[model samples]
Target: MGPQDNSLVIGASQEPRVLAGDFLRVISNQAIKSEIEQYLFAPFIGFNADSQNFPVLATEVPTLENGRLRVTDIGGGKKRLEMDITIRPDAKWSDGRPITTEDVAFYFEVGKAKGMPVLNPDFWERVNVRIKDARNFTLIFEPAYYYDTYGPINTYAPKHIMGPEWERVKAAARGLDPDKDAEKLNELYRNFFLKFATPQALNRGAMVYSGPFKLKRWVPGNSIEMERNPNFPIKPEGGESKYVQKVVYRFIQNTNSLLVAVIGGSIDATSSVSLTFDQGRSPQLVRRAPGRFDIWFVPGAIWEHIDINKFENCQVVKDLGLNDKRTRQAILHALNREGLVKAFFDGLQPVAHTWIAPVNPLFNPNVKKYEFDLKKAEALLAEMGWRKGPDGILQRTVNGRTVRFEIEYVTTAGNVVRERTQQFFAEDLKKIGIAVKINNAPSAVVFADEFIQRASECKWTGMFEFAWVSNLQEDGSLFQYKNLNTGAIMVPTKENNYQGQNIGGWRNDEFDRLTSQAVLEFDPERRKQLFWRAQEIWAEELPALPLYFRANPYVVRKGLVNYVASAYSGGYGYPGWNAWEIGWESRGAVKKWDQAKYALST
Candidate 1:
């Protein structure tokens, strides 16, 4: 393998799938969008390791310092803020069509539609967009409806590829009569755009790529193959060198088997395969396959947590589905989060104090913390009017019926540590006279669009055990309360036809206003204060209980260059956001590429 002639194989415990196409995903979920985004789609703005924003398809990020953003008066005593945007002329879709401004216009239309998933409808609704040229555009905002460090809000869909459906979608989003007929307009848009919802669309290349990689083939649960786009602007940084020609991501569903594949020469390293170091496996992996594998445990942004949804339903829970906040707090107090870090993670995971990772500079240190105490938990439940029945089990009566504090806990199927942790949770609660029913689903379903929506439909029972890795440029954790930015607080339902991201169906007006002002403020100190206030509110409300800040442990092939060290939470790019910078090097000449790794090993 030479600089330009090699191929890279990445192993993942779950399939890094690009489902249906971009259209279906933007309309459905985000976890899936994040998986393929760095490789297939380039946002209008890109971010660096420091979280500093830059232009990707766009020429440069619009900024107050750059004079790209301006304030003006539009009418009689009326005012609006205007901003200019420039799309990069050198960019092209994988199909060779030039990337243009109409794409952004098309994207803007879809975002403001009745049925589609838009993070902030008010932000899109108040803004007026007009194309100045094929590569330039102007945005007129209703006062201050925009953020300078716009995250991935500008992911554009190609109009040439999407066809006249863009026009219909736009007309339906904007027309006067359609406002009263919201349902009809939504159906109209869904009927036209839903054709891409099929898996067959992907087989026909319905998913277009604007980044350096193109989907070569996808074999469902087996693997996803990709090849470098010739028209992509990336070139080897040294001017003349051979790098990766193809990237094959193999789906190995077993957590243990991820190491097996890396050791067996079936893959180079992993993009998402991570294991905690509880068993001293990192050393064991290298010892069993010495000189062939390297284990790297970088601090990861993955936040593992338990999400409890509050709702009333006629569906019976025979003592399960506790609605009282006191019970929820008791549940948090019962489990030993500190022991979870010690016994399950070998002290690798720090007990989580808040939603934001401690690795982030913006993290708030002061808050009411949840410390594990079984007696404290038992007392709280007792104080909440839950009396001990003859069986020593806790029970409460309401409206002529008795409800017991029972629960259904769910998580992904293959994680040994997580399953063990769940058992520990069950054991802890049992000591306090509560019973838990455990259910595990496949990783795909656990992370699917339908799973989180269970909260919205009143279908999910007690707790869902899950984890999330933060996007490098997002602060949604603090701001995405259901009612403030969305039609309802959580993921939109059939009544709304899924148009927002309050996936937990949460609502709090005070936190919402704080987050709103937080996003608008440009100063870091003020923003930090706002975020701290959000953490304070979140701790009191108990939306989702933060478990720990986890680590990403990857078994890298010893010979792979510029690979392991470059990986990040959302990933800046392949080999740290630039595939061209990553290449294969001979082990005999490996000193230069792997000097640091070599030193660490020695």
Candidate 2:
């Protein structure tokens, strides 16, 4: 039987060990886990095992000699691996097909031709991978020095399944043009490749791999079963490793169900519980099931915030003269973030003082943080010639009309934190004479149609706020101007397009340049300096107000061994199932009953 078939037989609870929240959903959707799987399936040029260190993939230490990486450069932006990557000579897919360089090339072709937008678009546009010789290959970067935002993190897929069809698709998409328009090229690629993203394509069994495990069965929205890959390349005896024979992923949706299964010995491990249960729930579970369950708390990379949209020339905002910076500054000063954090989160969240978190390598310690000061805000508004009107609301005169604007706040329904924060902002802003309205929608529709696609055009929300989760690397591309910069609001011709992550429609050319420069610089110090400069720019311009950073605290059973909770790496959970181990438990005795019960009750 394959590793997927080897059921270790977890107890009878239906709840999964993992739960989806703002942070969980964002990170899970990214290919971070899939990227890590590359190490098990095929060797990458470099890898970063620990979050704090540089990658240890191709060359252990990458040095900058003058301006270029000191490793083997293959000219024309291509770089060569410094060492020979020796795979298991007998490595084969479950179907017995040998994994080869051709597979890598074929995968890239499919990804590019199909416009499979992975992490790095620039790298894919410029570089091509080909076999230099047996056991060696060349990664040719774009001829015109492309930005290395993704670097070696882009994992290669098997080309054998995708090569021929990809080439034909590319030809049709390109239409025999040597230099096709970028927009047309993108459309063709996206239309064709997105067709294959079916539910079946995501199945593990349908996947051919040389990794340690293979997929045996998938009960969607419920559980996934896997067994050891019999064709896996086992390491030599002297090498260190602990390979599991079977793995199961149970899908549990609710907190009550999860707790019951875990305590009853049906669930082995779980991460990211949002239920405010008592402290003793986990302890009680361990006592009930003696040696069956293990629990861990890992550091997470997710961050949340409300993004503002700075739409210009709307009827509502135009009357209020809200397109002015002084107006925006006054509005910022009117918000009581501390109160919002305390009232909404029960003081559980830390004020997010800077754009970059403390855990980020590029975080600047010297950046200034905004404080809640209604007096300063009123003063600024008065300075901008906005006086208190009969209704006690500040009103400015612009275009011969009373400068009054109504602000709309949008958030997803059913999220308590978002709702509370929105209410606080609305109520506080109302005190300062700004009419704040609140609108709620389903999370899925808001994310797909509004947040990702139409964010630039929507001006309905005067200051939109929502949760934003960061990826493992701490890169700010999601909020970069190219993606979310709103600085264009200042320019008459470019107002519509300026709404980058600049939900507030705040923009600075220098900030945009700094972000762009940071992407290409491989030097850590230089990158850090660029980030500091950018942070300084953000401090001066409140494009989007920083809220507080929340923490995920997990309560695990006692005596579970070999678990490490990382703050910067695996935000709120183990890095993988392989990184965990359960200690030997007594056959039938349960301990710490009160502790476990307390956790559940809370």
Candidate 3:
């Protein structure tokens, strides 16, 4: 890992579910996409490890003191939040088009389109945009909102290139019948955004970037390679633009293979999904290679949880009685999560009762917790009309037939640690007369639009184990029962083209009201109380079972300057947030003696 290294190969365990970096169209595989977009698109602001916002494409961070942020009382106990942001003078797309408010206007306009698959569509509905000049724009939020100044759009699209295609898509939208031509319209939108240009016209499409890196090549299911943007003018904090000329995200689905590649020096670093704590905690991998790698397991905003399908089509819900809250509560009570964490994580992680981690300031410590109790689980199951049969499996008579309590447990296949968790969960459930049918698939399959998000098309029936990457905002939209403003069910369905974050179809009016109030209340203590009540409701309803907050294991090349592999969730909550500043330390700058600091253990 020389300072003059020309390329960096980072191993990733999952392929991006989508081809486009546009956040609006991306409904799954957010963690990987967030990291990939960090290199290709410039954010209005960059999130740092200190939980602070710094200027990236913008001239400075907006604040009330800076006169860029203002909260006006509009009477009748109503308030409006407005933020003025000025783009950096030198910001330009890789295609040589200047980044301007026109691009921002295009972004907002597209997101505002009816039937558009945009994340946080509710937030965009309340926001009004005003263009002051080429470099400046103002975002006005009616009735105000917490986290208003966090920046609205993730990245802007080049209006010069996308405007024409967008117009075509809009025209098509106007003519097409939404009910019959949903997919047809979706294809048009995809062609406009994802399939930006055919191979013949590569320079005029989605590849046009406004960040430090430009797309060099993308071999689907294999790798995504990026080269430093030649037109990038913005300088990072250390005065360096980007270190390596190229960065390759190599897809190695198997965790074991990913670890092998990392230890064998084939991969310079490991993405967050590359390795689990159980795999990285091996002493051989950490201690065997001196002066080559730095291995650390740090707490992150990510949390592992199980989403029990509540859809009516779900066989588990229909036959095994998972729709009942008592059944869901019993399932959680049967699992020994504390023991699992201690055995698998070496006590490095804490068992979670809710989505909020203890590390988060908003976490409600008083949330209801389910201790491992087989008897209690059995009692709950019995209350739900389940009884142990002659074979020791729970069964109930339904519609003149005997239905056994069995469920299909699913997770990523290649992850040995996750597979172990499934096995442990199955064994634990068996004690309570519940039979678990373990099923595993590739990360791509598990995270597919049809598998995870689209309620009508999802194949995974019973429960799925995966990690959710969250930020400091702790947006409650993920758990909201319904969009209070739109009166639409928060669950992602075919009607929305799977463009929502609520994976589980769990809903509660009380939970929705609490989150609605919490987001509007900016007071720290008042917000905490609202979320505390929300978490309490969540724990009682048992929509999803929180396993533990991940102590993410990160492996990277030693002496990689400005490289961060710690738990930094302030911005996009991924390691590549500062990709522009990451480079290797020169040989003279790399200390020699510190390399053997952990040699005593070996």
**For all the candidates, what are their Cα RMSDs to the real structure?**
4.5, 8.2, 3.6
Candidate 1 per-residue C-alpha lDDT over 295-364 given as tens digits, one digit per residue, 9 for 90 to 100: 6555646678887765454244324435556766788898899988887766767888787776665678
Rank by lDDT (best first): 3, 1, 2
lDDT (Cα, tens digit) per residue for candidate 2, span 118-208: 3333334555665664434555543323233223332344444445556676778656332434345544544443333222453523355
TM for every model, in the order presented, reads: 0.85, 0.66, 0.91
Rank all candidate structures by their TM-score, best first, as comma-separated numbers: 3, 1, 2
Worst 10 residues of 3 by lDDT: 591-600
Over 4 Å off, model 3: 1-4, 27-29, 151-155, 177-191, 197-206, 236-242, 313-316, 389-391, 485-488, 495-499, 587-602
Each candidate: what lDDT?
0.63, 0.47, 0.74
For candidate 3, write residues 1-602 as lDDT tens digits: 43566577888888776644344644445577667767888788877665567788888888989999888998756579888889888888887878999988998888777666555666666788899999999988876767776632354677887788788779878986646667776556655655563332343345588878888877777888888887777655544533566888999888888878878887787787788888787876877568888776657677899988777665546677667788889999999999999998876778888998766778987889999998999999898788888878999987667899888888888888898898888888988898888888887677765567755454767888888877666757888757674454567665764456777777789998888778778788999999999999999988888898887677778766555643453354456666776766552322212212211122
TM-score, model 1 to reference: 0.85
